[PDB]
Symmetry: D3
Subunit: 251 residues, 6 copies
């Protein structure tokens, strides 16, 4: 399992998957939230993917630099950009965001949507990444992450099998193993289709509790300034499935 194998497998279907099987449908709202903080300056998406968020941002006239480790994901992105009327505002960068190498450039916002931070499989690595994000922010800037909230996510300890989504001729199931000590989720997204085809798309995450994530930020030189349930600024509480957290350079 690489930094890359998530992207590699899923690239060509990431955008086609229906409902709960796909990524969350908050592209537009995410773009507004980031854009609302971005002003006229450029922003850095970590793990830009197929640009689910980047393109909505470019529609708002926001320059976005997308770091991505996956060749195949990156190709999807560049394909979509060439067809997008605003593609020129999306700047794809091949690279590993655990070890960003962006030189002089600085950003008004650095964000990681939909568990991207949790794609780095260790607390250390996540602290490194945050510290790096910090160092790329300009005076005003902020760091925005969207993360599963373990409490509200009600994660069975051990192994689990669940129904993700139904289509007319396929089902989307997920088989997974949870290690509540390492705090890791390791899983297969399974697609079963009529007449018997089976496709498996594996992923691993390391998650953090909020109190922990906030201390991680603190070590990174970040301090938390707001926390919501989603990009529409809904109230965050214990039963929130996700959180959106905004951080800024610390005193």
């Amino acid at each position: 399992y690489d930094e890359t194998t998530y992207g590699d497998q899923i690239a060509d279907v990431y955008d086609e998957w229906p409902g709960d099987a796909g990524p969350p449908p908050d592209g537009r709202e995410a773009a507004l939230f980031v854009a609302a903080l971005a002003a006229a300056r450029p922003v850095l998406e970590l793990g830009v993917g197929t640009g689910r968020v980047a393109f909505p941002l470019a529609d708002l006239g926001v320059e976005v630099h997308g770091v991505e480790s996956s060749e195949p994901m990156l190709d999807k992105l560049r394909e979509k950009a060439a067809a997008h009327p605003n593609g020129n505002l999306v700047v794809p960068v091949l690279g590993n965001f655990a070890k960003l190498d962006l030189g002089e450039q600085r950003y008004s916002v650095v964000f990681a949507a939909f568990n991207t931070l949790f794609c780095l499989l260790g607390q250390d690595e996540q602290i490194d990444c945050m510290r790096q994000a910090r160092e790329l922010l300009e005076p005003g800037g902020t760091f925005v992450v969207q993360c599963l909230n373990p409490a509200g996510q009600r994660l069975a300890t051990g192994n689990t099998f669940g129904t993700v989504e139904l289509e007319d001729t396929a089902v989307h199931l997920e088989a997974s193993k949870h290690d509540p000590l390492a705090q890791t989720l390791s899983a297969h997204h399974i697609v079963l289709s009529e007449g018997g085809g089976i496709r498996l798309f594996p992923y691993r995450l390391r998650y953090a509790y909020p109190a922990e994530l906030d201390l991680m930020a603190n070590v990174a030189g970040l301090e938390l300034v707001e926390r919501h349930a989603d990009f529409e600024r809904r109230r965050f509480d214990a039963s929130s499935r996700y959180h959106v957290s905004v951080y800024r350079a610390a005193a």
Copy 2:
């Protein structure tokens, strides 16, 4: 829920050629004989209407008891199964198959001593509004004495998880029957795929959707349709109905 092509027809269409072959808990419940006795006891020894007759799991047991049964069914393939069976049945001449949608019954002058809907058939109509319409049309088809009987999953005793679930339905030597399902406790809908995995590598999916009603609500729907509840059991063998009953069988008659 993102099963964007679901008809009043696609349940039947898919399942017709295996509906009768599925073992144990995978197949329909094994109370055909009982349900026929139950309905028959209620026939003014006269013709009854099965809503969603299917392959005739109930209709043929009724024909064996000398009861005339009109079966309304929306699925071309189920109806083909039913007709193919009737030709071979020694009493098939007592089963009258009707192609049609029972949300919009059109049977003219004919009246019935019993209109029934077994095994969640009524909940196949995906709406409270539609269900009421159907009950009222049932009511209007009953003769003086007549009654309307429904067999329905009882939400309480069915202990339905909120949200999505995945479950083992039945095991065979060379295949498993699983169910993948989505429950919307507000819309009160169950939306699901019955999955059959086989030693080949083969996979067949058979989707279904239900809108369920709670007994208090269902009784109020019957009241709106001009029916009043006359009895309620756990099964067609008249076992006592209580909170932990998985299903109920309810009998309604025209209102005062």
Copy 3:
């Protein structure tokens, strides 16, 4: 699940039994089991009930312990003979085609008779398990002991009715299990399912009849056995209610 022998477990799983990764495979306690058994073996031969592919037999042979292995499954037995020919100590493993519900070993006696990894529970009834225990007892020498490793229902927290679970993940397949539990007949009846990236599906069915400790102990008494020690595993960790398994040692009764 209508067509289940004493054979169909083995027949199906033999060529993959040894290949399945992590939790999908048999427990990785072969060496420890051998040690545990060897310590009670002395200088005499031991009888493994349902020797299978020799997951425990070969570790025993490595310790210089002679092992007679009873197995009903042609295919399992063939795996065993194949590994024995290749093993440096294969000669110390004695395979025996037979059904251990009806052992027929004549004059031979054993310093230990053991059934690992729920093998005793493969006999689908309380009656058959008693019979087998009685037979094992009658095959022990003076000193001998009878050793079983068994799932502990309490610690195993079995749901009532049907369940479906993820057993293990591989890069290109998943191992699932579909099961039915009958808490009254105390039976577990299941399919181990392997889905692979091809679209291939392989099903491997099994059936167990479990027994609660208090009940198994009574069964042993009726068979002329009395319990001497109980652990959680072959490393002699303390047995308690949340132990997923137990290892019980019985000897002939006074």
Copy 4:
């Protein structure tokens, strides 16, 4: 168990109980919600109680007629009114709201906060009540109810026992029985104090599910106009513990 025994017991502590033991802290918000619908005409609260909502409404210059069955609850109300700078705007009525008897008077809003409609132990009785509320609405009028939402309320079937709230020198527990058929909750709120004292305060509800409630409203001649999670108009979904529903006369 009368229409009366809920109030009779709880009156003298209803307002003193802390946190989750007391009634919800949305009196102000309720008042605002009702007031916005009130226009220039008087409104009718069903089971006004101690005036937790009535008085906030009076602060907004809205005339409130309060119907209540419990002598002791009513006494608490009148006591608070005399002290309240706007007490004269609250009009207490002894009576059973299952059998309202208000003659010619008409209201711009009839409301029932905090499960009050659910105090009537039968679907029949609830329908009568709604029909009667309908007939007391002027032309524009609306009927507002706040009700537990069974889905979001995740009610165990059968008996349960639970912690309600903690004080320095008491605990608030709750012993209850759920009949999922009759859809009734029958309970004792229990206060154990450090003295060795025990007080019990029993209550009964019959709840309805939203789709059922709506159909009841229809039979009463009402139609649903809006539904929220609370009086601040948050969105109502499956996991909403309560709902607030606004109904108006039907076409």
Copy 5:
């Protein structure tokens, strides 16, 4: 904890407790079941208590000998008998039914209702008791037990606290410890009253699973002849909270 302390405490309330707090309301049906098996000969109730079943049997003209360890329970029995028109047919015996001592006398039925046999805290003791019951049966005789069925009882592993019953001015709660190895239930029935009154009634049970109980009977010289869910001969299955089992002397 004695073989006695169950009875001693509960005697004066055993018959007064409402609903689910009381003993099951199947006394009449029990008597009918036992009478049908009784033939012309006398029957022996183990742990007769306050004669919840013995008196209904007397009403059927059946002679009942009742063994009881609890002085106070026995006193309740004798008090009811004197008042009962058929009390003369109930023969109380002070004694411990783990160690019956009835000499020459033989019975057409020996029975233990409502977990009575589970009152002996050990597999050994229970076998002994069965073997003695066997040895007291005449030729035709049968041994009858009513027992909690652990499967259908869905017993939490570990401690629990539940609501047993509700009264207008008291609640019945139960605090409990389950040892799934020893197969023991150890508990306090708790009554809290509006006074400030707390009463604790402790009990212990050792249960057996059916397969195990049947093996026990085999060791005692009994073989199982029929099993129901209750004395009305409803069908026993996994979800049956109790079972009624009828044994007879073995071949």
Copy 6:
């Protein structure tokens, strides 16, 4: 929430005179001896510091091993119990009681070969910030060799319900120990009353509050405090720590 009179002190004050008398699961864990052996092994020839020494359930077994112990305690009544026991104990002179709040230790020049907090004592400090401060101070009191040892509930294996719960802790012939608690999974706080109901009609309430930390988080706290983790067990007998371990015992030393 509404226990608005909760000090560093009100746990101790209330429980002191029954802390040692409570049976089975209601009392503190019976691992005093084992803790003492574990700590003494790390202790070397310098004094050890117990945080929240309480009634000396661990201190006295240590003094039995000839180890000098300084016990910080905030509770007047607990300390009174401790002093009472020491006077009667053959080795009490080795136990040195200190009135103080270990969130704000003030021990001057003295240094320790071990500083430990047993049975969730560190979690008595109701905040992540306070717990770090306390770890940093412990760090600063350790000599060169020194280690800092904590015994803490492991939330994963503790399987804490989210929200409020009510449970049976222990049973006596004439009293039950129940527990009523509220769990805030965001604040990571447990707040509760231990309730004793007795045959008299008597009610005793003993309230407590914890802030727990997950191990990964606790380690990062230790890192911020200048500590690095050197070993982790499930208990003082060094059994293996895993997901289903109810507690953990963690040893930290000064960082490179």
